[PDB]
Design a protein around this nucleic acid. Structure first.
Ligand SMILES: Nc1ccn([C@H]2C[C@H](O)[C@@H](COP(=O)(O)OP(=O)(O)OP(=O)(O)O)O2)c(=O)n1
Ligand SMILES: [Mg+2]
Ligand SMILES: [Zn+2]
Lengths: 208, 118, 179, 873
DNA sequence: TAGTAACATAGTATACATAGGCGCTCCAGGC
């Protein structure tokens, strides 16, 4: 979302929860990466668990959510005593931490551990001083703007059984950007004024 | 309490005697193996040596870079519990940058906490 | 010569590219997001010509730069990627050779899956996510309709090296130790 | 936000695994600008757990289990909780205070009245074990109480009622699909203000059609219909017409193209029907329409069993967007489908209440089968035509067939709505929920244990007690204790006059009379001792009194004359429902898995019932009167007279003499029989005398327990038995009766041999207790064999609770009669099948007639066999 | 370090089932 930050599982577990935001002291973390050894893995019908270890604290559990239909990477479970790099975001549940695995990669060059530890120390120092410095009625409320009104009228006017697509919408309206088209379409679909017919790019009004 | 449940600091051959009765990981350049197989010698890349002993003689042929997990004994020797051989088929490993990494880590241990720090 | 190693936070703080000439610097980062929409377009098949051709709904495409009509076209890679490092993130745009190096497959190869195997195309995009490289980026600031928008152009991507990178990191941490 | 905020809640929901300590409320709110009601959602946070710690009298060390001779106090308990438990189980913030409570339940070694320690803390902290023990405390209560129950019993909310919120807030982001949202900080601000009339709701009734494709073995949706009413009153009469708007949508499954000029025909007929391209378009249109209409009650047939699961599965497979619009809560991960008994389906439609007519029909009335055709035939008086699944594909050739299919679907939806309005389900459900206090969607779901549990919970909470904590954790089983008593009958035929006497609400009156309650009766199979007759009424007697007094007013309304028959039927159904609720409240005391299990409490009631029946029988026999029958609360008297006024006077005298003794118990005349035919226990037939006065009275047939009311005999045998028993009770000479019976039997035999009877009068109906695949001995079970064949052949996926019909065919394979059962469609379609006449003449008519005619001289089994011509020798 | 386009940029796991009582006949099949 914003920036990945290398860290260590010791810092991960020592982090605290404040208003859905995990802070290790005065350091905010949302996505993290860690490099370590897998000691034991357990196979679930859908998920796969791993026992990562960075020799800084007790071994940690990492959960990788894989769909059992895609029999591509689950059959390639990494054998033990292998050093791998894990990128993902952590999760908290009943005062025991957990890790969600966005990506798992076996490590080929083995100077990467020292590079990773240097990243950890340097980033921790830099961002710790970066936070260390100071100065851091109930109505339905309806109403549509003119742009959304034009979009709705354009959607309504078409006689095609499958409805309009994005190309025609962009062609007819040259007075506003594509992003405005996307926002108006999203809002109209959320309010139920339009619905998709076949694909996500086809739309049609519901009243007609 | 098995050793894999406790923190193991990375200590080179420089400060072997300062971590007595403490878990420790060591890595480096294999030099010589005793014919018995219970113990061997290791190089830290700085010209210094460190000896490792095992309760049972080693059964497999070892070579290349190796790391050992153990504890410093009264004789400043390492009682190994596990070891892993490091790959050298593709990329060389430069131990000097590793050593300076240990020096830097010891320089600022606060940002690399050992154990659970409250 | 030597790459002007600069964190993106420093790049946005000093206002790189606000001068009359663009500024050049390179950095290592990891890809966090890519856009698969509008990524493919038809370029002019004439040699050393890359103007976007216009379909005439007849199987023959006429190029305005060469004023010439051809029955075939060549695919050309255009991509927008979200680069991100430990501190900040940036939006960059690639070209044929750089995106082809990043993805690892030539454009004509991709010309088949988008027509016959969408799943394989999605898989190819997927397996290249969360990779780290060294990108040379040139920054310049152009104004369009009275707002200044910073744009990033990348002309070279390379695999990450560890020796000199580690030496530079050690040098920087030593330097910050005094400060 | 402006001071107060009034709204009327309908449904509640909570999630203790993702958003602990929050409770959602959905309902209606009045808007002055538009002069209408709109949907609203209010979400409540900060619900704290409550624990009660029981101090000891002497300090016992755990390791040794001995007393150290040290007195105890509240300070010691506080110190032990703070120092040991809080640090061990990671509890940071808490509030503690001593209180007084009363306990009168199963847990032993607890004083009736004592001082407890009340501890409250936020729900996000871990949960203590259910069996905690300490140095100074011996027990704890309320460790695993849910948040919804805590909120409901703390705020004294009893069903739907008007609520007010003090100092609301505004959410940063939308959560629900409601028009207006609100936020409450603490459950202290919510107050009950119910003193006014409820607002109207919006009702939607719907039904769809399905077809099975040959290539892909899945069920597709090809047509839908829906009817909407906008101002459905909740407490008044059902509006007429019951619908105000409607819509229909049709689509082609995957390949077949619509017949040519279909759109032109639709325009010509000016029908508001929407054509779609693929299934995804239909699903999207349906979701958009339900979101736009915003219904509050969705009514359909077999919703929970088949329709909802198919709809959700097709939504998942077709990858349609915005599946959560079917409910009211924004969710993206759909719950696991099928799962346990209706858990996933109920969770999928959160915020919207589902009304299935099948469950309501099962609860309220009694039928031989519960498919839509039978319900239409019985509740209404109309015929519904059934379209086989096979022909559906063929109807895709001409536009007229498609229009007929759409009209049939619309008619099906209209029939469902008419049945729901006729049965008067919504007012009854609302009244029951307001009486009990649970969530009324669960009331619509069914079941009798939850209502009683919630009623007792409310009654005990209101009276400053402590309730037991929740337990962690097919066919009728073996009996556990003695039940009622049935007197020895006096078999035969009676002609002079029969009188019937009966008690009113025997078991509630027993409970109210003898002051039987959890608190009062002291429990150490042995029947306990009666309570001391100087105490006060317990909670159970008062609740039973309220429930039994709620019925006398309905009976008084019934007694009024000049009423339309439908209103009489509705009142009768309501009174029967109230009686069943009271009886269920009694019977829950014997449920093994119940929260208030207590066996002696019911054994005492049954023992007193038997004793009272004995005493009444002896007292009646003392007056030189002959007693012939009685069934655990009633007495039959043979007056041996003809004058009616004498019988009335004798009954009045007996009633006056009996009522003179007891305090609350009462007796009454339940009927006067002109002639009675008694066969066995709980098996008789009689003519009930209805006094119309004015010098005349009308006699009506009545049967009890015979093989004429059972659902597992063929219609031919039932008709023959009804005719014979009608002839027997008539006033004629015996010889004429014998001759008429013989002539009727000879005609029946000749007609059956000739094969002139319709096919329909041969079916046998049975029901399945379990799933068809769970019977190891399917070889000899016909209603399992036919069910398995139906399941394996096509669709409709017959399951537990359904009814299966079958007939016996002649396959020419010299097998037993029980292994040659076939469905009626198989008999009609296949050519090598015919109705087995000998089996039907030997095992269906002969036993019934023989059993009915047993106590009549001149007719015997061998004569019956000879009359049918069934090879006499 | 020409040539490229158009104009801002995205959340996803899970975990938790309900069900009033007993008394008195019927049938199918093997022993
Ligand atoms: N579904 C039922 C019906 C009856 N009973 C038991 C409890 C009753 O006390 C007893 C007598 O039932 P009656 O049918 O004779 O009904 P009541 O005497 O309670 O009421 P009413 O005055 O309507 O006859 O049978 C029961 O447990 N469950
Ligand atoms: Mg009764
Ligand atoms: Zn050109």
């Amino acid at each position: 979302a914003q920036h990945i930050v290398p860290c260590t599982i010791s810092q991960l577990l020592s982090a605290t929860l404040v208003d859905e935001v995990f802070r290790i002291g005065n350091v905010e973390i949302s996505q993290v990466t860690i490099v370590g050894i897998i000691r034991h893995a357990e196979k679930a019908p859908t998920n796969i668990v791993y026992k990562i270890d960075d020799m800084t604290a007790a071994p940690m559990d990492v959960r990788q959510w894989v769909d059992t239909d895609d029999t591509s990477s689950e059959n390639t479970v990494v054998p033990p005593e292998t050093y791998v790099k894990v990128a993902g975001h952590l999760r908290s549940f009943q005062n025991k931490k957990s890790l969600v695995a966005f990506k798992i990669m076996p490590l080929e060059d083995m100077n990467e551990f020292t590079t990773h530890i240097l990243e950890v120390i340097n980033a921790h120092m830099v961002l710790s001083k970066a936070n260390s410095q100071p100065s851091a009625s109930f109505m339905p409320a309806n109403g549509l703007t003119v742009a959304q009104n034009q979009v709705l009228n354009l959607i309504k006017a078409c006689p095609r059984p499958e409805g309009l697509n994005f190309q025609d919408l962009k062609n007819q309206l040259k007075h506003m950007s594509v992003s405005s088209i996307k926002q108006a379409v999203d809002f109209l679909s959320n309010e139920g004024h339009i619905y998709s017919t076949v694909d996500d790019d086809h739309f049609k009004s519901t009243d007609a | 309490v098995d050793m894999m449940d406790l923190p193991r600091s990375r200590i080179n051959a420089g400060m072997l005697a300062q971590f007595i009765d403490k878990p420790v990981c060591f890595v480096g350049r294999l030099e010589k193996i005793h014919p018995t197989g219970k113990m061997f010698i290791l190089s830290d890349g700085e010209g210094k040596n460190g000896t490792i002993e095992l309760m049972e003689p080693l059964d497999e042929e070892i070579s290349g870079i190796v790391e050992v997990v153990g504890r410093v004994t009264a004789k400043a020797t390492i009682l190994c519990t596990s070891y892993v051989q490091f790959k050298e088929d593709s990329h060389p490993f430069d131990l000097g940058l590793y050593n300076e990494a240990v020096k830097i880590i010891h320089d600022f241990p606060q940002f690399y906490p050992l154990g659970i720090v409250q | 010569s030597n790459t002007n190693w600069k964190t993106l936070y420093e790049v946005k703080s000093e206002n790189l590219g606000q001068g009359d000439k663009p500024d050049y610097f390179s950095s290592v980062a990891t890809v966090v997001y890519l856009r698969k929409e509008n990524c493919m377009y038809q370029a002019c098949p004439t040699q050393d010509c890359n103007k976007k051709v216009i379909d005439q709904q007849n199987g023959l495409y006429r190029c305005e730069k060469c004023d010439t009509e051809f029955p075939n076209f060549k695919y050309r890679m255009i991509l927008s990627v979200n680069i991100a490092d430990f501190q900040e993130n940036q939006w960059v745009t690639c070209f044929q050779e750089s995106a082809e190096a990043i993805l690892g497959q030539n454009a004509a190869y991709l010309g088949e899956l988008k027509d016959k195997n969408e799943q394989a195309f999605e898989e190819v995009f997927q397996n290249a996510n969360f990779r780290s490289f060294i990108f040379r980026v040139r920054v310049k600031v152009e104004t369009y309709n009275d707002e200044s928008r910073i744009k990033a152009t990348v002309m070279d991507v390379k695999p990450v090296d560890y020796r000199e990178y580690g030496r530079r990191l050690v040098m920087s941490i030593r330097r910050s130790a005094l400060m | 936000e402006e001071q107060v905020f009034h709204f009327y809640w309908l449904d509640a929901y909570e999630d203790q695994y993702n958003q602990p300590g929050v409770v959602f409320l959905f309902g209606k709110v009045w808007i002055e600008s538009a002069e209408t009601h709109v949907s609203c959602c209010v979400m409540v946070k900060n619900i704290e757990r409550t624990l009660y710690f029981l101090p000891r009298e002497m300090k016992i060390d755990l390791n040794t289990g001995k007393e150290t001779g040290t007195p105890i106090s509240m300070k010691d308990v506080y110190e032990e909780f703070d120092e040991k438990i809080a640090t061990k189980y990671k509890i940071m913030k808490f509030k503690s205070k001593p209180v007084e409570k009363n306990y009168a339940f199963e847990i032993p070694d607890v004083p009736e009245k004592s001082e407890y320690l009340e501890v409250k803390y936020s729900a996000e902290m871990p949960q203590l074990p259910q069996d905690l023990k300490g140095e100074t405390f011996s027990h704890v209560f309320g460790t695993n109480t849910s948040s919804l129950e805590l909120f409901l019993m703390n705020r004294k909310i009893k069903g739907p009622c008007w609520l007010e919120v003090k100092s609301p807030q505004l959410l940063n982001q939308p959560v629900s699909w409601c028009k207006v949202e609100a936020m409450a900080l603490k459950p202290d601000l919510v107050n009950v203000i119910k003193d006014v009339s409820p607002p109207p709701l919006v009702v939607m009734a719907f039904s769809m059609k399905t077809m099975q494709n040959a290539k892909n073995h899945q069920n597709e949706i090809i047509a839908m219909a829906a009817l909407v009413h906008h101002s459905f009153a909740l407490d008044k009469a059902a509006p007429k017409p019951p619908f105000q708007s409607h819509f229909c949508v049709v689509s082609k499954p995957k390949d077949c193209i619509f017949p040519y000029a279909f759109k032109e025909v639709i325009e010509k007929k000016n029908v508001k029907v929407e054509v779609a391209a693929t299934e995804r378009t239909l699903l999207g249109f349906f979701l958009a329409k339900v979101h736009k209409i915003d219904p509050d009650i969705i009514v359909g047939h077999n919703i929970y069993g088949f329709e909802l699961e198919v709809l959700l599965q097709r939504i998942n497979v077709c990858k349609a967007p915005h599946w959560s619009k079917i409910g009211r809560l924004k969710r993206s991960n759909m719950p696991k489908l099928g799962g346990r008994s209706g858990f996933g389906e109920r969770n999928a439609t959160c915020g919207r209440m589902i009304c299935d007519v099948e469950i309501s029909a099962k609860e309220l009335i009694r039928c031989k089968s519960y498919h839509l055709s039978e319900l239409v035939q019985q509740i209404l008086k109309t015929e519904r035509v059934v379209i086989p699944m096979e022909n559906i594909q063929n109807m895709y050739s001409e536009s007229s067939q498609l229009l007929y299919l759409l009209e049939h679907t619309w008619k099906d939806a209209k029939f469902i709505l008419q049945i729901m309005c006729e049965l008067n389900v919504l007012p009854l459900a609302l009244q029951i929920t307001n009486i009990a206090g649970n969530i009324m969607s669960r009331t619509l779901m069914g079941g009798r244990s939850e209502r009683n549990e919630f009623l007792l919970l409310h009654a005990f909470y209101e009276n400053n007690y402590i309730v037991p904590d929740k337990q962690i954790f097919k066919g009728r089983k073996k009996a556990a204790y003695a039940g009622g008593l049935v007197l020895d009958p006096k078999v035969g035929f009676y002609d002079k006059f029969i009188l019937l006497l009966d008690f009113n609400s025997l078991y509630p009156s027993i409970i109210q009379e003898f002051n039987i309650c959890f608190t009062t009766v002291q429990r150490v199979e042995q029947i306990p001792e009666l309570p001391d007759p100087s105490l006060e009424m317990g909670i159970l007697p008062r609740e039973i009194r309220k429930l039994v007094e709620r019925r006398k007013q309905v009976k008084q309304l019934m007694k009024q004359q000049d009423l339309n028959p439908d209103l009489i039927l509705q009142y009768d159904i309501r009174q029967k429902a109230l009686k069943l609720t009271a009886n269920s409240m009694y019977g829950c005391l014997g449920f093994s898995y119940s929260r208030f299990y207590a066996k002696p409490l019911a054994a005492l009631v049954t023992y007193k019932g038997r004793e009272i029946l004995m005493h009444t029988k002896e007292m009646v026999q003392k007056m030189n009167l002959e007693v012939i029958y009685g069934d655990t609360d009633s007495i039959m008297i043979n007056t041996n007279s003809t004058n009616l006024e004498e019988v009335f006077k004798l009954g009045n005298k007996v009633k006056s003499e009996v009522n003179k003794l007891y305090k609350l118990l009462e007796i009454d005349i339940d009927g006067v029989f002109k002639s009675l035919l008694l066969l066995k226990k709980k098996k008789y037939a009689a003519l009930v005398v209805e006094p119309t006065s004015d010098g005349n009275y009308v006699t009506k047939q009545e049967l009890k327990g015979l093989d004429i009311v059972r659902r597992d005999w063929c219609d031919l045998a039932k008709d023959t038995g009804n005719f014979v028993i009608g002839q027997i009770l008539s006033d004629q000479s015996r010889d004429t009766i014998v001759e008429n019976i013989q002539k009727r039997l000879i005609e029946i035999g000749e007609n059956v041999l000739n094969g002139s009877v319709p096919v329909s009068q041969f079916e046998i109906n049975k029901a399945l207790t379990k799933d068809p695949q769970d019977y190891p001995d399917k070889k000899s079970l016909p209603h399992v064999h036919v069910a398995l064949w139906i399941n394996s052949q096509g669709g409709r996926k017959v399951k537990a609770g359904d009814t299966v019909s079958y007939v016996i065919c002649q396959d020419g394979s010299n097998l037993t009669a029980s292994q040659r059962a076939y469905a009626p469609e198989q008999l009609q379609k296949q050519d090598n099948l015919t109705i087995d006449t000998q089996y039907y003449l030997a095992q269906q008519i002969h036993p019934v007639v023989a059993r009915i005619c047993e106590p009549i001289d001149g007719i015997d089994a061998v004569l019956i066999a000879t009359w049918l011509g069934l090879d006499p020798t």
